[PDB]
Ligand binder design. Structure first.
Ligand code: NI
Ligand code: NI
Lengths: 8, 117
């Protein structure tokens, strides 16, 4: 599944 | 600083698994600073974690609209498209991002994944 990148 | 404050509050809520609280924090910050791409990118992430991929997509699109040179916005948009099973568009989004940040590893990986499906 797609990766949800960390928030900034 | 107030915007950063709300963003941090949102990041913390997200860190403890309170996604709805995170969305509320990011949305309040967005009201104060509607041109802040970081807020839309973070809200896109929260919506994706929640499983509302249409809203994750809308926020990823807004991130790209506001800051087209930022590769991560295309990753937000493209990830939402993948969840939405719109892979052709996801692939083109990674490609579009690479026209702005050619050496971005996440976009390169995304493109590679879409080219391997
Ligand atoms: Ni404006
Ligand atoms: Ni462009």
């Amino acid at each position: 599944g797609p990766t949800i990148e960390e928030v900034d | 600083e107030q915007v950063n404050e709300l963003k941090e509050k949102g990041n913390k809520a997200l860190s403890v698994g309170n996604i709805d609280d995170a969305l509320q924090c990011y949305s309040e910050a967005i009201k104060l600073d509607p041109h802040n791409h970081v807020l839309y990118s973070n809200r896109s992430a929260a919506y994706a974690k929640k499983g509302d991929y249409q809203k994750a997509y809308e926020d990823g699109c807004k991130t790209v609209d506001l800051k087209p040179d930022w590769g991560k916005g295309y990753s937000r948009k493209a990830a939402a498209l993948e969840f939405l099973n719109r892979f052709e568009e996801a692939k083109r989004t990674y490609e579009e991002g690479l026209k702005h940040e050619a050496n971005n590893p996440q976009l390169k990986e995304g493109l590679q994944n879409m080219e391997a499906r």
